[PDB]
Structures are given as structure tokens and as C-alpha cells.
Enzyme design. Structure first.
Site, PDB file in Angstrom:
ATOM      1  N   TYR A  60       0.823  -1.205   0.000  1.00  0.00           N
ATOM      2  CA  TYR A  60       0.000   0.000   0.000  1.00  0.00           C
ATOM      3  C   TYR A  60       0.860   1.260   0.000  1.00  0.00           C
ATOM      4  O   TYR A  60       1.774   1.405   0.819  1.00  0.00           O
ATOM      5  CB  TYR A  60      -0.918  -0.058   1.232  1.00  0.00           C
ATOM      6  N   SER A 130       3.183  -7.203   1.786  1.00  0.00           N
ATOM      7  CA  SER A 130       2.133  -6.481   2.534  1.00  0.00           C
ATOM      8  C   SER A 130       0.778  -6.708   1.861  1.00  0.00           C
ATOM      9  O   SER A 130       0.380  -7.863   1.650  1.00  0.00           O
ATOM     10  CB  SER A 130       2.546  -5.015   2.666  1.00  0.00           C
ATOM     11  N   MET A 131       0.033  -5.652   1.524  1.00  0.00           N
ATOM     12  CA  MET A 131      -1.185  -5.827   0.745  1.00  0.00           C
ATOM     13  C   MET A 131      -0.915  -6.595  -0.550  1.00  0.00           C
ATOM     14  O   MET A 131      -1.781  -7.344  -1.024  1.00  0.00           O
ATOM     15  CB  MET A 131      -1.770  -4.445   0.473  1.00  0.00           C
ATOM     16  N   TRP A 155      -0.574  -8.920   4.417  1.00  0.00           N
ATOM     17  CA  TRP A 155      -1.707  -8.273   5.078  1.00  0.00           C
ATOM     18  C   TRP A 155      -2.979  -8.584   4.299  1.00  0.00           C
ATOM     19  O   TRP A 155      -2.995  -8.476   3.067  1.00  0.00           O
ATOM     20  CB  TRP A 155      -1.496  -6.749   5.133  1.00  0.00           C
ATOM     21  N   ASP A 175       6.569  -7.021  13.453  1.00  0.00           N
ATOM     22  CA  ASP A 175       5.635  -6.320  12.574  1.00  0.00           C
ATOM     23  C   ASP A 175       4.466  -5.762  13.379  1.00  0.00           C
ATOM     24  O   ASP A 175       3.785  -6.517  14.076  1.00  0.00           O
ATOM     25  CB  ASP A 175       5.137  -7.319  11.525  1.00  0.00           C
ATOM     26  N   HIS A 207       8.020  -4.651   9.581  1.00  0.00           N
ATOM     27  CA  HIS A 207       7.217  -4.822   8.371  1.00  0.00           C
ATOM     28  C   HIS A 207       8.001  -4.520   7.101  1.00  0.00           C
ATOM     29  O   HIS A 207       7.708  -5.093   6.039  1.00  0.00           O
ATOM     30  CB  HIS A 207       5.978  -3.917   8.442  1.00  0.00           C
TER      31      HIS A 207
END
Length: 258
Positions: A60, A130-131, A155, A175, A207
Site C-alpha cells: 500500500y 504487505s497488501m 496483510w 511487525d 514490516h
């Protein structure tokens, strides 16, 4: 013999630096493609061989440069790697899955001649941060023909993914964006027990560990891609009976070791 095997016999030390293949890059403008936002292709040069392909998504608000080191690292060990930019830097995880799908279709069907000449369109995999790691899990659910999937500090608000694609998840102990207790570890546990799966947890990492040169992420991502994209059993040794001081947890159902 194995017709997909590439490069010399590996040592762990060799997998913490760029590999034996020279790397070229091709910048894909967002105006030239539909269904994703362009990005950068890293691919082997100075060779007549073909290689499997990998589509990778950043997270993101991030762009493809946040994973440039890893796209180059993978390509240098024998892969065609497209690190995408998204249509909007704010797209969510399932939008990122759709854009990985479009990026894979692009690699197979409309990539530049120099890139297409190095690609075996039958052997493809995905990865993402992540995303983008949530999107990696979702597309693995949607496309069981993919050879492997590596979600990095993933995520997602959905926690159960019904996929048969072999998955290796990288979590970061410390994280606070996608805490492993709420994201990485539930994703690992909720994957089918019949799917080859591995979870590695990086000791005292944050993260953003995937966004810069990281020996552990290098070793495990290269090895999972080699084992499944290339059927290269020479890389089992780095994934089976592991004791790695950079890791504070390692879990697996061990389907990949024989």
C-alpha cells in the site's frame, strides 16, 4: 535429466547475493498496458535458455522500486520477474490480485520480444509484499496452475485461502502493520493441510524488512521458486531440516522434502 534446471550447484552463501545470470531491465509505462500500472521487468541476458516467470506486487502506497532489489536478485538466479506498479498506489489486496493476474497474462502474451524470448510461459509464480502479499494469497486461490506463491509480511482482512499452490510465507517478528499473530500465522494455519506450505519468521524484524537486501528473504524466496517453478530438487537442502539463526520460527508440513 531435468530440462528446467539452471545454474551451478547452489551453496547458501551464493543465495545471499546476485546470481550467475546477467540481468537486463525493461521499464513498462502505465500507458502501454491495461489492467495494471506498468512496472519493471528484470530478466536474464547473455543466454539462449528460457526460464520461469514471476509477477510481484508491492504494498500500500509503495511503488515497484520498493522491491527492486528482490526482482534483480531473483532474475539473476534465472527467472523473468515483473514487479508491477498498481493502477492506484491505494489499491487493496484483492485489487492487487487482479493486477497480478493481468501482469501474468501480459508476460505470456504481449511482453517485449527480448523478454518473451527468455520466458517459458508454462511455468509461472507470484510473490508480493504487505497488501501485495494478501494479493498473492488471493490469486493463488484463483489460479491453481501457478507453480508457487511467496507472500512477504502479508496483510489481508480475509484469513482463509483455499489454494493448492505451494505457499511459503515470510513473517516479521516485530511487525506492527501486519502483526504475525493476526495475519501471517493465521494465513499459514488456515491453508489446506494438503497444500505444501512453509512459514518462516524473521527474528526481530519490522514490516519493511522485505524492502531492502535481506539474506534470509533471499535464500528462502530463491529456493522456493527454484524447487517448484524449475522442479529443481537441488534447493530442497535449504528448505528441509533447517536451522537458521536469522529465523525465530520455522513451520512446515514437509510435503516439499520428498
Amino acid at each position: 535429466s531435468n530440462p528446467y534446471q539452471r545454474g551451478p550447484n547452489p551453496t547458501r552463501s551464493a543465495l545471499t547475493a546476485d546470481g550467475p545470470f546477467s540481468v537486463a531491465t525493461y521499464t513498462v509505462s502505465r500507458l502501454s498496458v491495461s489492467g495494471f500500472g506498468g512496472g519493471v521487468i528484470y530478466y536474464p541476458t547473455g543466454t539462449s535458455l528460457t526460464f520461469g516467470g514471476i509477477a510481484m506486487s508491492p504494498g500500500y502506497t509503495a511503488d515497484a522500486s520498493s522491491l527492486a532489489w528482490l526482482g534483480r536478485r531473483l532474475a539473476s538466479h534465472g527467472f523473468v520477474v515483473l514487479v508491477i506498479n498498481t493502477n492506484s498506489r491505494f489499491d487493496g489486496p484483492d485489487s492487487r490480485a487482479s493486477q497480478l493476474s493481468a501482469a501474468l497474462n501480459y508476460l505470456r502474451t504481449s511482453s517485449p520480444s527480448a523478454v518473451r524470448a527468455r520466458l517459458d510461459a508454462n511455468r509461472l509464480a507470484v510473490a508480493g509484499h504487505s497488501m501485495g502479499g494478501g494479493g498473492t494469497l488471493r490469486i493463488a486461490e484463483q489460479n491453481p496452475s501457478l507453480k508457487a506463491a511467496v507472500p512477504l509480511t502479508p496483510w489481508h482482512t480475509d484469513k482463509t485461502f483455499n489454494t493448492s499452490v505451494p505457499v511459503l510465507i515470510v513473517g516479521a517478528e516485530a511487525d506492527t502493520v501486519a502483526p504475525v499473530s493476526q495475519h501471517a500465522i493465521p494465513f499459514y494455519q488456515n491453508l489446506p493441510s494438503t497444500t505444501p506450505k512453509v512459514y518462516v519468521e524473521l527474528c526481530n524484524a519490522s514490516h519493511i524488512a522485505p524492502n531492502s537486501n535481506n539474506a534470509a528473504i533471499s535464500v528462502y524466496t530463491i529456493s522456493w521458486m527454484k524447487l517448484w517453478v524449475d522442479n529443481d530438487t537441488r534447493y530442497r537442502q535449504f528448505l528441509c531440516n533447517v536451522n537458521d539463526p536469522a529465523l525465530c520460527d520455522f513451520r512446515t508440513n514437509n510435503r516439499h522434502c520428498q
